[model samples]
Target: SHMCDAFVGTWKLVSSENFDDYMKEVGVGFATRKVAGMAKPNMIISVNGDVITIKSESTFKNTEISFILGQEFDEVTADDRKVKSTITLDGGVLVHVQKWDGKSTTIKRKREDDKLVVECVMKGVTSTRVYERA
Candidate 1:
C-alpha cells in the first residue's frame, strides 16, 4: 500500500534544469521546443499491480504510454520509430529502460525536495529534468 501510494496520481513539471538540451536530443525543433520549454507539462501515472500507465499532458500536446514492470514494450518515438521500453522499481524510485536508434537509455526518476528529478542516460547524452509539485 505504501509503495502504491507514493507513485499514484498526477505530477506537474515546474522547472527543468537542462530541459532545452533534453528536448533538443529528443528532436524537438525550435518553435515547438520553445513552447515545450515554456509551458508546464503534467504527468498522470496510474499504477495497478505491476502495470503502469503514464500520460504526459500539456497545452501543446499530450502523450501517453503503458508499460509493465520489468517488461519491455514498443515505444514510438520521433519519426514514428518504434523503440523498446522497460520500466521497473528500485526501492522507491522508478527506472525506465529505453532502447531505440541502435542504442539504449536508462532513466531513473524520484522525488526529492519537493521536486521530481528524472535522470536519463543514452548513448552520449545524459540529461536531467526537475519538476515541482503542482
Candidate 2:
C-alpha cells in the first residue's frame, strides 16, 4: 500500500548525469544512445493488487515491465541484454536488481521533494537520473 501510493503516477525525465557512459557500458548502439540522450521519457507507474507495472515511453522506444515484490523474472533490457530482474521496496526506496552475463547491477529510486532520483550502477560506472512529477 505504501509503495503503490507513492509510486503510482507519471514522471518526466528532468536531468541525466553520465547517462551516455552508462548506455555505452551497457552496449547500446551509437544511434540508440544518441536518441536516448535527448529523449524525455515519461515513466508511468501503476499498481493492481500486488503487481506493479512500469511503462516508459519516448519517441525512440517504449517499454513496459510488470513485477511483484520478491519475485524474479527474465527480462531483456532496453539495451538488449538478457537478465534476470527483481524489484523490492524498502524504506520508501525502490530497489531493482539485475543479473546478467556474469555481472550484477542495482538501481535505486527514491522520491525527494516532488522529484524522483534514480541511481544506476554497473561495472563501476554510475549514472544519476532525475525525474519530476508530470
Candidate 2 structure lDDT: 0.87
Candidate 2 lDDT at 132 equals 95
Model 2 spans > 4 angstroms off: none
Error in Å for residue 21 of model 1? 1.7
Clashing pairs in 1: none
Native-to-model Cα distance after best TM-score fit, residue 17 in candidate 1, in Å:
1.7
lDDT per model vs. reference: 0.73, 0.87
Output the TM-score of candidate 1. Answer: 0.80
Write one digit per residue (lDDT tens) for candidate 2, span 30-114: 9889988888899998899988888989887888899998899888777678999999988889899999878888888888888
TM-score of each: 0.80, 0.92
True-structure RMSD, every candidate: 2.5, 1.3
lDDT of 1 by residue, 33-112 (tens): 78867767787878777667888788877778887778878887533447798888898889988777676667788877
Candidate 1 worst ten-residue window by lDDT: 74-83
After superposing all C-alphas onto the true structure, candidate 1 shows an RMSD in angstroms of: 2.5
Best by lDDT: 2
Q: Which stretches of candidate 1 lie over 4 Å from their true place?
A: 2-4, 26-32, 78-81
